[PDB]
Amino acid sequence: YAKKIRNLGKCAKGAGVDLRVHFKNTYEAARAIRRMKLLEAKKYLNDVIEKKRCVPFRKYNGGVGRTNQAKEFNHTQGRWPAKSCKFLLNILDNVQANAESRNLDVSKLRLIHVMVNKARPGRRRTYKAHGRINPFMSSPCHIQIIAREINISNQNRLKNKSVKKQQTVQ
Amino acid sequence: AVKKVGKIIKKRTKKFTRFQSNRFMRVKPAWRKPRGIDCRVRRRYKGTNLMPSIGYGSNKKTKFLLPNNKYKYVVKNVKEMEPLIMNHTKYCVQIAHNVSSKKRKQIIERAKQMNVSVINAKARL
RNA sequence: UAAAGCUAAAUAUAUGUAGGAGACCGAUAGCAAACAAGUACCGUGAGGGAAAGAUGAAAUAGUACUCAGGAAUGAGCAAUUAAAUAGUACCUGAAAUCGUUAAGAUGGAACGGAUUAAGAGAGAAAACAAGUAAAGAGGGGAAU
RNA sequence: AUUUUAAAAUUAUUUGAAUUUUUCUUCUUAUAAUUUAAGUUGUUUCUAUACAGUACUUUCUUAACCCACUCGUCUUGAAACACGGACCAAGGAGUCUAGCAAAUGUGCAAGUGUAUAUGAUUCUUUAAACAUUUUACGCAUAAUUAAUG
RNA sequence: UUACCGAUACCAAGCCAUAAAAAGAAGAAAAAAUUUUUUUUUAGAAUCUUUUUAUGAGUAGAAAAUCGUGGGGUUUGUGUUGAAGCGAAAUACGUGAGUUUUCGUGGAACAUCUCCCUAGUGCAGAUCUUGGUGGAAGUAGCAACUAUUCAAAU
RNA sequence: AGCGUACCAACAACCGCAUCAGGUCUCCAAGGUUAACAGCCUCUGGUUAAAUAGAAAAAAGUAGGUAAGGGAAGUCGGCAA
RNA sequence: GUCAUCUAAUUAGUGACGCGCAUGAAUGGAUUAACGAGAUUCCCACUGUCCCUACUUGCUAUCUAGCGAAACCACAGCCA
RNA sequence: GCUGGGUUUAGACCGUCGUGAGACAGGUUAGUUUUACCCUACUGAUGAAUUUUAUUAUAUAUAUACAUAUAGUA
RNA sequence: UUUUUGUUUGCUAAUGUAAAAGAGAAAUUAUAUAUGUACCGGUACAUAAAUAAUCCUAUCACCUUUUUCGUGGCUAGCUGUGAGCUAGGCAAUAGUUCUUUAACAACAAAAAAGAGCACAAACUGUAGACGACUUU
């Protein structure tokens, strides 16, 4: 994992190797999640899956609509990336399980590192124009998630000068 | 600008970076001299990168002296250390980057015996 | 001494096989082909014609087991190894590109040069202290 | 390590002159010193009674003042409303031989080059190195003429 | 009528290179200590050293000095107490190509500047080749064939 | 005697670089309306699928409709309807 | 091109005229019923062609879930 | 943005010119009008942020910029 | 509001100033004249006329003794602050400068004292591509 941890005893990690979900949506979801208690994050994910709360598309915001729920994050654009959300939820669950297996309280766990890297594209073919074959590739991803339990010089002359200054002030 | 320290004068502390090395990744900073019409650098327009030139060179007398005032000498072995027994105030040892730790230590020890300065004693320390 | 003929040797070999070589090439190089290459695949056909090597000393060390998972996978207080960010897409793993974190900047570009500045890192081999003394740890060389 | 000397100048002396009678009057006889000669040395701090700090060095970072137009390219002229360039990595272009030339190096020199080829007590390297029979040929040493010459 | 500001031009000084010119095959100086120790040097590399003066634009081009890469002969070395490489650097050196070093990775080779020998020897461009990767962009779009819906099962 | 005998025949099995609205030969051929193997609807057989669904129902587009009074005054031209 | 004709008006159309830059006889000339997805003009019918646009329907566009390209691109992107 | 009637591709006809292929700044007819999803511009549609920033006064005739100002909604 | 110390896992104590060294200064108005003042724009009398070439405000530390006057508080006295007068003779020494650490504003901690909205969701349709708006 990418993060500098020091003590892995208070941390619980979870990974997703090559996910069949779009890199951008998933990234957005991750961003939305970040710096949150694990349970709260899970709840948020659930809500998004049921189309109650949206994730704000702030980075990859090209063409994404203009939802009502985006006002919650001071933004205008937002979406409900279902499959991606589900994937993320699964990973969260895994992380939770891992934590349980150790000795970490799930209530005091915060997501300290939610990384989404883009995996190698799954190549497919699309057919265009005047007999033209074009790449119809997917954008798979790796997801890395880390949860964590959260609760000169003197100089004599210089000294003299300082003293003088003090005296002056007085 | 100019960087006087002792009698040691350095005319140009800044590196001369290649033209446009800051504009395209593919172009490294390593100085290359621009050729061809319409260079701007070649033509020396105000505001562009400067062209390294012989005027910049350091006085023949202090040239390869480092801040210490000693010419740096690279050392791979004790035998090599030895040419500088009669020169401890004028050349300073640097131990080769590829020397194994024991050998380095030995070299350092030798240097101390000789009173010769080591500029990189701390490698693998 | 024509209008009949034969005849070994030296001489030539980018073909084939078999040897031996190099101041040769080192996987975009070298044969097209270091690998199930004239193979896959394309062309009605004559023809055209690739890409693709490397884990480790040893897989007779190729991931046991536990937990979460529909499963993949993940995680481990677990496990092979010297080493798994050597996990079979496996040596090294650059750049473009992208992610996380931090710092900073931001009124229709950005970067840059010249000169400072404030930060933020780095550093002591010029950037102070030779020697003298008390006593430890070492190393030597010589004299007889 | 003798032009950081010699002289100039200046200071305190010493002998003789001068018309500019003058505590900087000049020459000159002699001796010491000094610097106005003969390119900056001294005093006191500070860093500092420090081993790296917030000081000092330097890399990066933005600022800020002033400046700064996309490079390559063909062109009288490119920032061009000229073309090529999305980006990056690797590959990617005056070479090799034949004969001639001048340049220069080297050996030999009216010669020179041992060509093929032979010979060896030569055989991992040895496809090189060595050796050249107990008037070869090249180029040069002579030119000139269509030509017998 | 002055005064002032104002160039890479001019002047004064330094330093760098180039060109030329002078010229060159033996010796103790000082300081610190306390008369003797300690601290520095004690030079002589002919394309070299010392000094002097003048000069320094530059495309096409020419030349010289360097620098680096793959291999060779020679030379003296570095490696599992970790080589090459790679990434970041560095009170680093060089005008500069670069060189050298530190940390991290790496896990096996690597140099030569001692001389010179050889080359398939240096890239930002060629609508360059090959392989990769972007912004465009989570956008265009996934609109012929009249049309689906409910319940259950897996 | 031997050989062929599955299945597809395009709707995704063929050729169109593809599970591409294209192309590709032949036979069988129901009721109604009707001149009609036309078109429209139905029975037998076959599907209810087609590189997507859902929600909204702006502009704009595209395939359509319909427009008072006028009737080519539009436009190169009654093109289109 | 002049006279007619068609129109409220005609560089069009038709019928004449003809010293015709440069028409003309199988380079076929002149005339022709029928035929033509032929070229041209006028008339009637008919209409959103137009006056003068309006409303409306499917399918797209639109938003969502899912998936998901490309051309192009020196860097980029306000003007006088 | 359209239209494509002409001009200015290939088909074709006539006239003149050319031995001819063909020529015509002579005539006549038939002849594919591709792409916005980029940036800006414009038209509309949301919408944060804004202390070296503000202030035409405030306060009980006197004061005070050597001063006020939070913010969030509406 | 006052005081104290500080600002020498991504965090969980916290710093920034285009400008402090006295950053001192409120008639108005004309420019071939103004300003006051007193009467009825007019008259008379003053006044500025190098107007910031000025004026104001600085340094009197100390504590104690003899006080005087002003201002602010509470029920003539008391206390605090500012200014003068009189007496006591008292203090600062950093070894020659290296900013004269002296301002403003924000904070953070410590003690002390006092005292609900909005979005969504459903609904709406005066709105509308989606937001947004209009509603409930």
Ligand SMILES: O[C@H](c1cc(C(F)(F)F)nc2c(C(F)(F)F)cccc12)[C@@H]1CCCCN1
């Ligand atoms: O020219 C002399 C000299 C002599 C000799 C010697 F005679 F020994 F061969 N050799 C010299 C050399 C040398 F030849 F290399 F030995 C160089 C320079 C000077 C040399 C110098 C004179 C100055 C002192 C050094 N030797």
Ligand SMILES: [Mg+2]
């Ligand atoms: Mg030019």
Ligand SMILES: [Mg+2]
């Ligand atoms: Mg140019």
Ligand SMILES: [Mg+2]
């Ligand atoms: Mg024969």
Ligand SMILES: [Mg+2]
């Ligand atoms: Mg190959």
Ligand SMILES: [Mg+2]
């Ligand atoms: Mg080891």
Ligand SMILES: [Mg+2]
């Ligand atoms: Mg590794």
Ligand SMILES: [Mg+2]
């Ligand atoms: Mg290996």
Ligand SMILES: [Mg+2]
């Ligand atoms: Mg690897």
Ligand SMILES: [Mg+2]
């Ligand atoms: Mg400018």
Ligand SMILES: [Mg+2]
């Ligand atoms: Mg031109």
Ligand SMILES: [Mg+2]
């Ligand atoms: Mg061209």
Ligand SMILES: [Mg+2]
């Ligand atoms: Mg281009």
Ligand SMILES: [Mg+2]
């Ligand atoms: Mg290219």
Ligand SMILES: [Mg+2]
């Ligand atoms: Mg290359």
Ligand SMILES: [Mg+2]
């Ligand atoms: Mg010659």
